[PDB]
Design a binder for this molecule. Structure first.
Ligand SMILES: O=C(Cn1ccnn1)Nc1ccc(Br)c([N+](=O)[O-])c1
Ligand SMILES: O=C(Cn1ccnn1)Nc1ccc(Br)c([N+](=O)[O-])c1
Lengths: 302, 301
């Protein structure tokens, strides 16, 4: 029993984290096979960061301008190139701790684990969701750039996030490992802001299923609804639309608990309309939207 | 910025997790140097659960009755002893992935990371606190016994918890790595129940200081309180007493934010009286008590 925000075990990724220094900038890199991946903004100084020309700044650098440290050992950089907003530093040694891995791009609503790192040294692991507005509500200080996000699907690590920056509201923006930003963000110091966020409806329903499985049943009711009617309600409360694909994905949880998705949507309808009347659900006074259907099944079964 | 329930990176512990089988019972063990630590209840049968005599069950076992599996490899057990409620199985191979480590027994209010494991394989990592009633609010299914709790406050792993059982209210009880239970619990399936839980006041204050560090001031007020009056009110909401030790420990956070400890105590009094009136603090609509003063300083600054 019990239900906790749970991260994947981080050991396979810990063995890939290194320190990358260029000039006075130090941040984190990901060392897989014979390449170190890190944010391209590592090459910038402050004046550069105002309006950088990355192509031009990069051509001026030699391999030996990049100091890469794995533990106490220096790695030797033998090549450098850019892909989108990530720098790829070819080094002389393949990482012997390289796990089986893939680069994947995730969708808003999907969750992943973040291994927060400073000076190439892992400091903490926590679970995040890619928000509908393409930010993450992480916990990152200066020096954390190049920290990564991942899922583990079997023995295979799927890397999905690399940390680039903090926005002024205190949320976080970054890229996939091919250096494509999530969201309408750029790696330069200009005015940027998170768009208005929405709640991830399918995840809230998943978490309501978790609550039931753990014996928290007070919000269940005799009513059902339809997708169209519920979606009219979701829109009003700044919830993402629920699709038939979402209903399909919750199918397992529906079967296990005897609460159809639209039955559970009637519960959620009522909660949005009336609140919780001083009660809690899984020890929360707010509706939690950072567990996916898969997360709930995995933790309440596997 | 941001503030998250953050666990320690788990890799140093993952490389210590093994599977221990005795008869039909399989659970997890922790392999450090040449010893595997696991709950002694691994040697119990169906009969045994109400009133096991562990000394009598154990004398009947030979080394070869214990199957220890580290990944794909069987380890050979070459000795066994019991210490309190843990079994220590001496094995023929020192663990080459043994980290620098120590065993520490923690006090209520302390936090740690749990690496939940099944069949000797890690499933997930999360943060927990030792509750005032000596339980933890974990996430554990059948087969999770022998999962451990730890901190890593430099490169040294401090093991502080080993999971033994789930109580009827769905909370969790276990031992230190010397096999002494936290709280009044025993490894027997007789009726036992957790004492009433309370809120960890010192941690809530730490978390209020975190909110200020991260730029949130709305819940402060112009008042102060004596320590004794604070405690008198706090106890009426099932909050643990705040001691002078606790006030001392919050000294650094007080100095960083410019808010005296008893001033913050006055804020907490008002929060308990008023609630949050539709606001949140660090993204929570409830007062959080599973971050310690040390945790706040580690994550914030
Ligand atoms: O934001 C950070 C540091 N930090 C603090 C917490 N998490 N990250 N560095 C940074 C700021 C603005 C920008 Br536009 C860029 N950039 O060039 O992409 C980098
Ligand atoms: O509770 C569990 C299984 N589990 C599920 C989640 N967390 N733990 N095993 C167990 C239960 C009661 C007792 Br008294 C004993 N024992 O003899 O120590 C073991």
């Amino acid at each position: 029993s019990g239900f906790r925000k749970m991260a994947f075990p981080s050991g396979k990724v810990e063995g890939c984290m290194v320190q990358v220094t260029c000039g006075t900038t130090t941040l984190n890199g990901l060392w897989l096979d014979d390449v170190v991946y890190c944010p391209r903004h590592v090459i910038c100084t402050s004046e550069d960061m105002l309006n950088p020309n990355y192509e031009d700044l990069l051509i001026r650098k030699s391999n030996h301008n990049f100091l890469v440290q794995a533990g106490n050992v220096q790695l030797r950089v033998i090549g450098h190139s850019m892909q989108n907003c990530v720098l790829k530093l070819k080094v002389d040694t393949a990482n012997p701790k390289t796990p089986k891995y893939k680069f994947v791009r995730i969708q808003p609503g999907q969750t992943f684990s973040v291994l927060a790192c400073y000076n190439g040294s892992p400091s903490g692991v926590y679970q995040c969701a890619m928000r509908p507005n393409f930010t993450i509500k992480g916990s990152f200080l200066n020096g954390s750039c190049g920290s990564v996000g991942f899922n583990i699907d079997y023995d295979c690590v799927s890397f999905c996030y690399m940390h680039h920056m903090e926005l002024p509201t205190g949320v976080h923006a970054g890229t996939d490992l091919e250096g494509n930003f999530y969201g309408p963000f750029v790696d330069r110091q200009t005015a940027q802001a998170a768009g208005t966020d929405t709640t991830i409806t399918v995840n809230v329903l998943a978490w309501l299923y978790a609550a039931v499985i753990n014996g928290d049943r007070w919000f269940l009711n005799r009513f059902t609804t339809t997708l169209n009617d519920f979606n009219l309600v979701a829109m009003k409360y700044n919830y993402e639309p629920l699709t038939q694909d979402h209903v399909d994905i919750l199918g397992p949880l529906s079967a296990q608990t005897g609460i159809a998705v639209l039955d559970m949507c009637a519960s959620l309808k009522e909660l949005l309309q009336n609140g919780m009347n001083g009660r809690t659900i899984l020890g929360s006074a707010l509706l939690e939207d950072e567990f996916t259907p898969f997360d709930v099944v995995r933790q309440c079964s596997g």
